[PDB]
Design a protein around this ligand. Structure first.
Ligand SMILES: Cc1cn([C@H]2C[C@H](OP(=O)(O)O)[C@@H](COP(=O)(O)O)O2)c(=O)[nH]c1=O
Ligand SMILES: [Ca+2]
Length: 129
């Protein structure tokens, strides 16, 4: 896998964000995670966390996996990095996202995120509280 550039356009919620990628606006859906909807318990906290992480970053990157790069809704499917730190992993590690939507051939960082989930659950953080 390879990191590619992108620039924040707008935070949307815990697991979607609008980025400019190859000079075009795109909505991205974070691979391998599920945040609560804003509507839902810890939804606003997940959204805030993503937003702060992305907005505070000097450099956003996107990293596609080996399989499909867009979903059925035309969202890009990627791992997103903020100043080299994976947003997908960070949400999971803080108990603000569950590992979810693990489809074969876009699951390169599954075990990394599962480990983060186990640590969050051990610490009874947020969703695991
Ligand atoms: C994360 C992810 C979601 N999706 C689709 C599956 C779900 O379909 P449905 O909309 O039919 O439920 C939806 C979940 O996204 P959200 O969690 O943003 O709603 O996005 C993929 O197809 N591939 C993926 O990697
Ligand atoms: Ca969601």
């Amino acid at each position: 896998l390879h990191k590619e550039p992108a620039t924040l356009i707008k935070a949307i919620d815990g697991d979607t964000v609008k980025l400019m990628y190859k000079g075009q606006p795109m909505t991205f859906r974070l691979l391998l995670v599920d945040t609560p909807e804003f509507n839902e318990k810890y939804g606003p906290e997940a959204s805030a966390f993503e937003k702060k992480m992305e907005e505070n970053a000097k450099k956003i990157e996107v990293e596609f996996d080996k399989g499909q790069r867009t979903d059925k809704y035309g969202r890009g499917l990627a791992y997103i990095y903020a100043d080299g730190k994976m947003v997908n992993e960070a949400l999971v590690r803080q108990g603000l996202a569950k590992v979810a939507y693990v489809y074969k051939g876009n699951n390169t960082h599954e075990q990394l995120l599962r480990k983060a989930e186990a640590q969050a659950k051990k610490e009874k953080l947020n969703i695991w509280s």
